[PDB]
Design a protein around this ligand. Structure first.
Ligand SMILES: Nc1ccc2nc(N)nc(O)c2c1
Ligand SMILES: Nc1ccc2nc(N)nc(O)c2c1
Ligand SMILES: [Zn+2]
Ligand SMILES: [Zn+2]
Lengths: 364, 364
């Protein structure tokens, strides 16, 4: 396969369906990427993650740089070999988590203390790109400065401007490393909060630099679905049409459906909540103690073929690890089934109808 | 298959190897039974438990009667259907756990408060047998009164005597329930602490009543391996030779090898400790942070084929659920491989040699 090749096979309105070909495998879009925090998708073996239908997973520069360490993972042979996942891996730049879990900020980057050992680290565009290389990331995310919501026009502009400067530094760092530039891909991140003029400026700067994909950052940070959808309405069209559009940190089923309707191709997002086509349910609720039905009536995942709500209800309330294993496999499988239905409906020119039917039942 | 049929295929000294045929499947002996606490073998899907080589698992009357409840499990279709394990299941009587986790004792039974909700329960030989029936247990354990170590001759005798009276009540309760007597098996439990005359009295009383199997209870309660082996030396020969001998709660690898050398056919027993043919290791130790080798050099389990000590080291220190999943699958697989080597060596008349080689390396 090539280093990177995004091809759109079908369209309906702003929605698109296709594939991203990379050296380690093919990614079907729209795609949902399970998230791996500490070099593991919570409670699932990689083979199980693959079994649910995932084509790619997400890794975090922040968590990994702290534990077990980027240099260590490199010495060990890379993240893929380390955790046992041989398909594509997209790694975030770390910036987002540093401002949420660990901080001295400057134009050079960010310095902070680990929320684990209390040690210090100076994350910068250059160091972020290097760490993702050490991990062996397939899709590298530019290092940016997220803008907290709400944000004043002035502050949103300053952060967007810095991010574009950092985007240029990320691009140059990536291209200067021969092995990384020839085998991996680099995605730029659009910022600008909820302001259209800033989003336009960010998109233009990003397209001028040139990236393999474009992510819409700064959303899903407390603005609500209505506002998010409004921002996506004018933001996504600003990005290059022939490259993937990645909405960072968005995962609620209805959010995904609405985002795909607005041009998004990639998603990622991180208990007793189980998704069903009839809306989510909390398995801990007493009404499920003797319910012999599976989590969802049509879901084809292994959990729904073998265990009842009553059993999983018992496991979760008992704090048993198998409870988490089963709930997680079903939920990730549900998400993949959702992406499959989306891809098929777009391919058959009936996505709008699918969106309508989905919402009618999901919120009924 | 028949309700119950134990056949010995080979022998060497006091060691035996053979099979126990039951309606739900065949059990190869010597056998190791993984333990299921709350209707689940910690962090493993039943298929994974089976994959490691287990022919039967153990369930607990105490934990299940508290959560989710015996009556509830029955209404739900039985423990097998509930947890998804269709092979044989041996259930303990609950008495042991009540005196360790939850108490008013009498000749009629024991009353106690749950260490969960604080509710009350009156476990008796009759209620214990009934609960195991409600669960759908294949091998039912008689309800006894364990003797704390150390125990005075007087107290050991009183408890042994009560246990034999309770053993008779267990037998009658079992036989009176048509469905249970025709489809399940009942094991009696020998008591008597470390005293030979009491063990002999217990064995005689048990054989007089008649059981499908005989367990050696009251050991592995703080007496040490030397003392335990000394008690087994004269205790096991007292039991009927043509029925299975079950050593309750004994699981350290060296303990199992020594017990089989003394006539035991069945075992069961309940972190970063990983077993290896070179002795156990604690994966949390810093010396494993960059060790690319598998947990054990020859173990054929899935964990050892796919992940390194370095990765599992990371997972466990990070508190990740996959860490527990992988460590548990390997350990249970190790135990099953140990039982297989024991069965094969006995069948080939070279068990004594195997025991010698095992110890030499395990403790080297
Ligand atoms: N809602 C999100 C989630 C993750 C993000 N990661 C980066 N690097 N930047 C953003 O703006 C994000 C927004
Ligand atoms: N070491 C053990 C473990 C479990 C036991 N269970 C019962 N019912 N009775 C004993 O004596 C036990 C001893
Ligand atoms: Zn499911
Ligand atoms: Zn292993």
């Amino acid at each position: 396969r090539p280093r990177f090749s995004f091809s759109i096979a079908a369209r309906e309105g702003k929605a698109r369906t296709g594939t991203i070909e990379m050296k380690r495998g093919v990614i079907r879009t729209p795609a949902f990427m399970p998230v791996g925090t500490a070099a593991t998708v919570k409670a699932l073996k990689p083979e199980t993650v693959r079994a649910t239908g995932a084509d790619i997973i997400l890794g975090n520069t922040y968590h990994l740089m702290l534990r077990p360490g980027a240099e260590r993972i490199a010495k060990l042979g890379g993240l893929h070999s380390f955790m046992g996942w041989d398909r594509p891996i997209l790694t975030d730049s770390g910036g987002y988590q540093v401002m949420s879990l660990s901080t001295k900020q400057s134009e050079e980057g960010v310095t902070f203390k680990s929320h684990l050992d209390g040690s210090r680290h100076m994350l910068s565009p250059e160091r972020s790109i290097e760490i993702q290389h050490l991990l062996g990331s397939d899709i590298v995310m530019a290092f940016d400065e997220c803008t907290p919501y709400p944000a004043t026009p002035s502050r949103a502009a300053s952060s967007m401007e810095r991010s574009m400067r950092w985007a240029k530094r990320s691009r140059d760092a990536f291209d200067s490393r021969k092995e990384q530039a020839e085998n991996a891909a680099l995605f730029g991140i659009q910022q600008g909060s909820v302001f259209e003029n800033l989003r336009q400026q960010s998109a233009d700067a990003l397209a001028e630099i040139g990236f393999d994909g474009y992510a819409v950052g700064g959303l899903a940070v407390g603005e609500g679905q209505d506002e998010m959808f409004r921002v996506l309405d004018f933001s996504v069209p600003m990005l290059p049409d022939d490259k993937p559009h990645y909405l960072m940190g968005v995962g609620k089923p209805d959010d995904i459906v609405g985002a795909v309707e607005r041009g998004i191709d990639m998603f990622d997002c991180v208990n007793g909540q189980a998704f069903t086509w009839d809306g989510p349910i909390n398995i801990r609720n007493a009404r499920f103690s003797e319910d012999l039905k599976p989590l969802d009536s049509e879901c084809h995942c292994a959990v729904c073929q073998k265990w009842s709500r009553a059993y999983i209800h018992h496991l979760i309330r008992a704090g048993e690890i198998l409870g988490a294993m089963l709930m997680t496999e079903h939920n990730i499988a549900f998400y993949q089934q959702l992406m499959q239905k989306i891809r098929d409906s777009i391919s058959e020119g009936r996505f709008s109808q699918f969106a309508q039917d989905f919402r009618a039942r999901y919120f009924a």
